[PDB]
Enzyme design. Structure first.
Site, PDB file in Angstrom:
ATOM      1  N   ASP A   4       0.778  -1.252   0.000  1.00 45.94           N
ATOM      2  CA  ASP A   4       0.000   0.000   0.000  1.00 45.94           C
ATOM      3  C   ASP A   4       0.809   1.303   0.000  1.00 45.94           C
ATOM      4  O   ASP A   4       0.221   2.355   0.227  1.00 45.94           O
ATOM      5  CB  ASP A   4      -0.999   0.021   1.159  1.00 45.94           C
ATOM      6  CG  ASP A   4      -0.333  -0.153   2.511  1.00 45.94           C
ATOM      7  OD1 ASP A   4       0.875   0.130   2.683  1.00 45.94           O
ATOM      8  OD2 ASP A   4      -1.082  -0.578   3.405  1.00 45.94           O
TER       9      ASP A   4
ATOM     10  N   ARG B  56       0.665   6.901   0.193  1.00 40.00           N
ATOM     11  CA  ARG B  56      -0.010   5.862   0.945  1.00 40.00           C
ATOM     12  C   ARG B  56      -1.399   5.732   0.378  1.00 40.00           C
ATOM     13  O   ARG B  56      -2.167   6.732   0.242  1.00 40.00           O
ATOM     14  CB  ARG B  56      -0.039   6.252   2.427  1.00 40.00           C
ATOM     15  CG  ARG B  56      -0.840   5.266   3.241  1.00 40.00           C
ATOM     16  CD  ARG B  56      -0.217   3.885   3.271  1.00 40.00           C
ATOM     17  NE  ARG B  56      -0.772   3.089   4.416  1.00 40.00           N
ATOM     18  CZ  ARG B  56      -1.940   2.475   4.369  1.00 40.00           C
ATOM     19  NH1 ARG B  56      -2.702   2.569   3.268  1.00 40.00           N
ATOM     20  NH2 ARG B  56      -2.349   1.686   5.367  1.00 40.00           N
TER      21      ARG B  56
ATOM     22  N   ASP C   9      -5.637  -1.352   3.947  1.00 40.45           N
ATOM     23  CA  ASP C   9      -4.501  -1.795   4.701  1.00 40.45           C
ATOM     24  C   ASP C   9      -3.996  -3.127   4.225  1.00 40.45           C
ATOM     25  O   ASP C   9      -4.676  -4.138   4.292  1.00 40.45           O
ATOM     26  CB  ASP C   9      -4.794  -1.740   6.196  1.00 40.45           C
ATOM     27  CG  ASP C   9      -3.536  -1.872   7.032  1.00 40.45           C
ATOM     28  OD1 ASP C   9      -2.527  -1.237   6.695  1.00 40.45           O
ATOM     29  OD2 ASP C   9      -3.623  -2.504   8.088  1.00 40.45           O
ATOM     30  N   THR C  10      -2.812  -3.124   3.627  1.00 42.77           N
ATOM     31  CA  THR C  10      -2.154  -4.419   3.311  1.00 42.77           C
ATOM     32  C   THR C  10      -1.343  -4.928   4.502  1.00 42.77           C
ATOM     33  O   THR C  10      -0.851  -4.130   5.259  1.00 42.77           O
ATOM     34  CB  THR C  10      -1.227  -4.254   2.077  1.00 42.77           C
ATOM     35  OG1 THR C  10      -0.293  -3.163   2.283  1.00 42.77           O
ATOM     36  CG2 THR C  10      -2.080  -4.059   0.788  1.00 42.77           C
TER      37      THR C  10
ATOM     38  N   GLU D 195       1.994  -6.025   6.411  1.00 43.20           N
ATOM     39  CA  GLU D 195       3.398  -5.646   6.281  1.00 43.20           C
ATOM     40  C   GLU D 195       4.075  -6.812   5.595  1.00 43.20           C
ATOM     41  O   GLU D 195       3.542  -7.910   5.602  1.00 43.20           O
ATOM     42  CB  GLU D 195       4.023  -5.312   7.647  1.00 43.20           C
ATOM     43  CG  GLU D 195       3.566  -3.967   8.245  1.00 43.20           C
ATOM     44  CD  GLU D 195       4.006  -2.759   7.398  1.00 43.20           C
ATOM     45  OE1 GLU D 195       5.190  -2.665   7.064  1.00 43.20           O
ATOM     46  OE2 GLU D 195       3.142  -1.970   6.954  1.00 43.20           O
TER      47      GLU D 195
ATOM     48  N   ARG E 266       3.555  11.559   3.866  1.00 48.10           N
ATOM     49  CA  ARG E 266       3.116  10.783   2.722  1.00 48.10           C
ATOM     50  C   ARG E 266       1.882  11.381   2.117  1.00 48.10           C
ATOM     51  O   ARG E 266       0.947  11.715   2.875  1.00 48.10           O
ATOM     52  CB  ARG E 266       2.838   9.348   3.103  1.00 48.10           C
ATOM     53  CG  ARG E 266       4.065   8.587   3.648  1.00 48.10           C
ATOM     54  CD  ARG E 266       3.777   7.153   4.066  1.00 48.10           C
ATOM     55  NE  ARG E 266       2.726   7.126   5.038  1.00 48.10           N
ATOM     56  CZ  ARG E 266       2.283   6.035   5.656  1.00 48.10           C
ATOM     57  NH1 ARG E 266       2.815   4.818   5.420  1.00 48.10           N
ATOM     58  NH2 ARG E 266       1.222   6.136   6.395  1.00 48.10           N
TER      59      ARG E 266
HETATM   60  C1  LIG Z   1      -4.264   5.445   5.120  1.00 50.48           C
HETATM   61  C2  LIG Z   1      -3.953   6.496   6.166  1.00 50.48           C
HETATM   62  C3  LIG Z   1      -2.985   6.309   7.153  1.00 50.48           C
HETATM   63  N1  LIG Z   1      -2.706   7.327   8.021  1.00 50.48           N
HETATM   64  C4  LIG Z   1      -1.695   7.191   9.075  1.00 50.48           C
HETATM   65  C5  LIG Z   1      -2.389   6.701  10.322  1.00 50.48           C
HETATM   66  C6  LIG Z   1      -1.474   5.684  10.924  1.00 50.48           C
HETATM   67  O1  LIG Z   1      -0.823   6.325  12.062  1.00 50.48           O
HETATM   68  P1  LIG Z   1       0.176   5.552  13.011  1.00 50.48           P
HETATM   69  O2  LIG Z   1       1.465   5.267  12.274  1.00 50.48           O
HETATM   70  O3  LIG Z   1       0.371   6.615  14.031  1.00 50.48           O
HETATM   71  O4  LIG Z   1      -0.414   4.252  13.440  1.00 50.48           O
HETATM   72  C7  LIG Z   1      -0.531   5.299   9.784  1.00 50.48           C
HETATM   73  C8  LIG Z   1      -0.838   3.927   9.200  1.00 50.48           C
HETATM   74  O5  LIG Z   1      -0.040   3.709   8.060  1.00 50.48           O
HETATM   75  P2  LIG Z   1       0.602   2.298   7.678  1.00 50.48           P
HETATM   76  O6  LIG Z   1      -0.468   1.230   7.454  1.00 50.48           O
HETATM   77  O7  LIG Z   1       1.285   2.538   6.414  1.00 50.48           O
HETATM   78  O8  LIG Z   1       1.593   1.960   8.787  1.00 50.48           O
HETATM   79  O9  LIG Z   1      -0.708   6.234   8.740  1.00 50.48           O
HETATM   80  C9  LIG Z   1      -3.406   8.553   7.982  1.00 50.48           C
HETATM   81  O10 LIG Z   1      -3.163   9.465   8.837  1.00 50.48           O
HETATM   82  N2  LIG Z   1      -4.379   8.732   7.083  1.00 50.48           N
HETATM   83  C10 LIG Z   1      -4.654   7.802   6.156  1.00 50.48           C
HETATM   84  O11 LIG Z   1      -5.579   7.991   5.359  1.00 50.48           O
HETATM   85 CA   LIG Z   2       0.110  -1.434   5.900  1.00 51.26          CA
END
Ligand SMILES: Cc1cn([C@H]2C[C@H](OP(=O)(O)O)[C@@H](COP(=O)(O)O)O2)c(=O)[nH]c1=O
Ligand SMILES: [Ca+2]
Length: 129
Positions: free
Chosen positions: A15, A29, A34-35, A37, A75
């Site tokens: 993702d 992103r 959510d994929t 890891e 991102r």
């Molecule tokens: C998809 C997405 C993720 N995020 C943030 C929230 C999550 O915060 P935290 O890192 O604090 O948990 C993180 C999850 O991304 P990943 O799944 O890539 O790790 O990215 C956003 O803020 N908005 C979004 O739309």
């Molecule tokens: Ca992920």
């Protein structure tokens, strides 16, 4: 919502993709998904699936939704298309991503993605098997 041009810089995982957008490198992103890891079950399959999809594309397009454009890591947050096909959706349809991180303002394709996830679940595909 508007499709904007971009070019692959690099596949990252299921993702996240690095793209060149308005002439600047940036990590995108994928919205609403959510994929796993890479280190988790189906993580390599989801990375391979997104890779093949973005690397085979003649044309990559970026589409921002109506809320937040960058997250707290810097991102970009966007729908990504590969020759017209939404990667976000295609992953969920194949049971390689869950619908996730749904925040109001940034959920135009929510229903579409749930609809794919239900068919994937019905087929016991991948994450659902
Ligand atoms: C998809 C997405 C993720 N995020 C943030 C929230 C999550 O915060 P935290 O890192 O604090 O948990 C993180 C999850 O991304 P990943 O799944 O890539 O790790 O990215 C956003 O803020 N908005 C979004 O739309
Ligand atoms: Ca992920």
């Amino acid at each position: 919502l508007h499709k904007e041009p971009a070019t692959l810089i690099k596949a990252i995982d299921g993702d996240t993709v690095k793209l060149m957008y308005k002439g600047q490198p940036m990590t995108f992103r994928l919205l609403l998904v959510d994929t796993p890891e890479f280190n988790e079950k189906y993580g390599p399959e989801a990375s391979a699936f997104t890779k093949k999809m973005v690397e085979n594309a003649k044309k990559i397009e970026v589409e921002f939704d109506k809320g937040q454009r960058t997250d707290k890591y810097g991102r970009g947050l966007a729908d990504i298309y590969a020759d017209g096909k939404m990667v976000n959706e295609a992953l969920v349809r194949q049971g390689l991503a869950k619908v996730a991180y749904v925040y109001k303002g940034n959920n135009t394709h929510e229903q579409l993605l749930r609809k794919a996830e239900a068919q994937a679940k019905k087929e016991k595909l991948n994450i659902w098997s």
